[PDB]
Amino acid sequence: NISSKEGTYAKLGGLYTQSLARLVAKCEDLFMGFNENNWSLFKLTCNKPCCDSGDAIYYCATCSEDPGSTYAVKICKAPSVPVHFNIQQDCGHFVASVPSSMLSAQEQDCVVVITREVPHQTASDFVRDSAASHQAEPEAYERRVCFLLLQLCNGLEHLKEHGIIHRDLCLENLLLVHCTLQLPRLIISNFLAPEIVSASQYRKFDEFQTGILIYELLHQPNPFEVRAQLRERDYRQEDLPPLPALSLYSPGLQQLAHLLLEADPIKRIRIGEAKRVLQCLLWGPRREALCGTLHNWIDMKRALMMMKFAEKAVDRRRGVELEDWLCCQYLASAEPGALLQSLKLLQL
Amino acid sequence: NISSKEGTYAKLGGLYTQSLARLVAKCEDLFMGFNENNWSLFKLTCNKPCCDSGDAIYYCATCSEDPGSTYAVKICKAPSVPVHFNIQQDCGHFVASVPSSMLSAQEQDCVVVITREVPHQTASDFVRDSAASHQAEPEAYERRVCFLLLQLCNGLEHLKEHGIIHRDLCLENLLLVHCTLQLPRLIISNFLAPEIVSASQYRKFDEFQTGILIYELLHQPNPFEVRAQLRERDYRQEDLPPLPALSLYSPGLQQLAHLLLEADPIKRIRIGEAKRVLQCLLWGPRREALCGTLHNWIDMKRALMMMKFAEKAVDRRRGVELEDWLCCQYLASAEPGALLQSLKLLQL
């Protein structure tokens, strides 16, 4: 059966799909895997917080029942999910009494949640400290923004699939976690009169907030917080402010923001389409029966991906990174149809 | 340029060749990298020998100048090479006085050579202890024999290229060494009247001895040691004894032995051709402008090889083995021409 050239090479093209799905499965294995009475088992590692997100403050802790691993103690300032890589996992909660010095009269009652992932900083912290870096090296920063946004989309989509809408997404509530075996791991933190806001508009709400976040990540102000015409009039995507063209990602990110900030909650782009767009900005086909051409591109990108992984197996300090995983997720589900969707969403 | 299907897939076919050559280079990195006065630096680990080859006895030792690694002390019973994976590397020598108890009147003067590789056993030891195993599970054993023979060919070829002919190859002088990061690593140990034996016949001598070794590895006697007609007459390959057909490798190994034992030292098969034949027996095309068909086979085998390596990069205890390296060496230099050579040498 190996006599026909393209019969064999069409046979190969299927086995790239095969391995890539297997690679994603194993990569998922790699990067992944209490009550008020059980709190005795815990022990804060130090007196300093590792992260402060306004909504809560974080302290690394160890558990005597679980030696070798570390937990994050989330102390909420306020007076249910299936597991995902980009979603904060709560392991139990209670009410404790905390010295006011730890929250930055002598003590306050706080809700204490036990988190599996220890945050290095928040997204707002990252934005706050990277203005000069964005100015100096725009392409590196804006690519990083696309990676964070991609992870954010993965989390939001997993939340939406199981009936959860985060009523307020903000940079302060997006946790950046260290990740090995550099690009951080993004994690979305947890929180008869009819409703003033319908369930319909809540469905396309994460998309709307994400559009605002794109501005905030690229060191631009919230458009509605600066332009009164956007608060008072029925605007259109043309009315939305632009971004300084500093790199290859700036136009595509501006386009994506406009697509996410469309006033009509029906013609607005879903979160899964935004994901595919970010994917296109990162690895996807650039400007250069078109499906056949795309089929070739997918096959070539898959072969080059398998090549990078194969060379990592024999290199003693090149190893598998989060970027490799995310890139595999894209190429494994890559189809010429969906790529076309994303290409003219980017109006290319 | 990615518009044409087979233009792209012919573009891929070149990049498999690219990576595979790179994989071989890095695999080579992985599996690879004194006087009488310096002997003070050394220290035998224990009182027991780790290997006895008749020609010499081996003792593991440590060096104070080189902590963390182990050396093998080769004590020769007798009263210059470039580096290769299958060739014993001497690091210095001298004459020492050894208690006669260590050689298995109270002491004897022995030549002591410092070896980089610590042997587990010899090939004859392996043959001696595996008769039942060969009887019980023939295919596993005979495949192992092909792997050892392959490594032996790699060593002999590297020796011949640099003007060295091992005047006596025997199973006792072939050292099996442990190898990680199971299939052992084979290592070839070191040693006016005109010459009775010409330089011409010495050129095809390693091939002749290898042919005898094939019989000895498969638990069969040396043909010349059992058949008088072979010692007294000008025999032909038809006169050479057969092997019991116990597995898929038995006919091909018998064929290879006959090819190596051809009486005429000119029509005899070289050591490099025997290598390609063993390669064919292990991974090569089986019985099922034929170059185009072979091109497809090479490309498919390369893609499957890159797949195995890529899946090893994300598997925490599947890792790169010696068999993977040897298989890469074959596929990286695989050409339809040379494969045809081997296929009808196996009279297929």
Numbering used by the authors:
A (entry chain A), B (entry chain A): 944 to 976, 984 to 1029, 1040 to 1064, 1082 to 1158, 1208 to 1217, 1239 to 1335, 1346 to 1405
Lines quoted from the article behind this entry:
Sugen kinase 223 (SgK223) (also known as Pragmin) and SgK269 (also known as PEAK1) are closely related proteins of 149 and 193 kDa, respectively. Both are classified as pseudokinases due to the substitution of critical residues within highly conserved motifs known to be essential for kinase activity, and both are predicted to function as scaffolds. A recent study found SgK223 and Csk were co-localized at focal adhesions where they regulate cell morphology and motility. Consistent with these findings, SgK223 has emerged as an important regulator of cell morphology, migration and invasion. To gain further insight into the molecular mechanism that drives SgK223 dimerization and oligomerization functions, we solved the crystal structure of the PsK domain of SgK223 and its adjacent regulatory domains.
To fully understand the structural determinants that drive SgK223 dimerization, we solved the crystal structure of a construct (SgK223- αN1-PsK-Cter) that encompasses the PsK domain and the adjacent N- and C-regulatory domains using the multi-wavelength anomalous dispersion method. The structure was refined against native data to 2.95 Å resolution. SgK223 crystallized in space group P43212 with one molecule in the asymmetric unit. Within a monomer, the PsK domain of SgK223 adopts a typical kinase-like fold and the N-terminal helix αN1 directly interacts with the C-terminal helices αJ and αK, while αL helix slides under αI helix of the PsK domain revealing an unusual ‘XL’-shaped helix bundle. While the asymmetric unit contains a monomer, the P43212 crystal form revealed a two-fold symmetric dimer with an extensive buried surface area (BSA) of 1620 Å2. SgK223 dimer formation is mediated by the regulatory helices from the two monomers with the αN1 and the αJ helices from one monomer interacting with the corresponding αJ and αN1 helices from the second monomer to form a unique ‘XX’-shaped four-helix bundle at the ‘core’ of the dimer and positioning the PsK domains peripherally to form the ‘shell’ of the dimer. The most notable feature is the absence of a structured αC helix, a critical feature in bona fide kinases. Instead, in SgK223, the conserved β3 Lys1024 from the YAVK motif makes H-bond interactions with Gln1048 from the loop preceding the β4 strand. The structure of SgK223 clearly demonstrates an absence of an ATP-binding cavity, which is instead occupied by the side chains of residues Tyr1008, Cys1001, Gln1048 and Leu1152. Residues from the αF and αG helices and the end of the A-loop contribute to this interface by intimately packing into a groove created by N-lobe residues Leu994, Trp989, Tyr1009, Ile1025, Phe1054, Val1058 and Val1089 of the PsK domain.
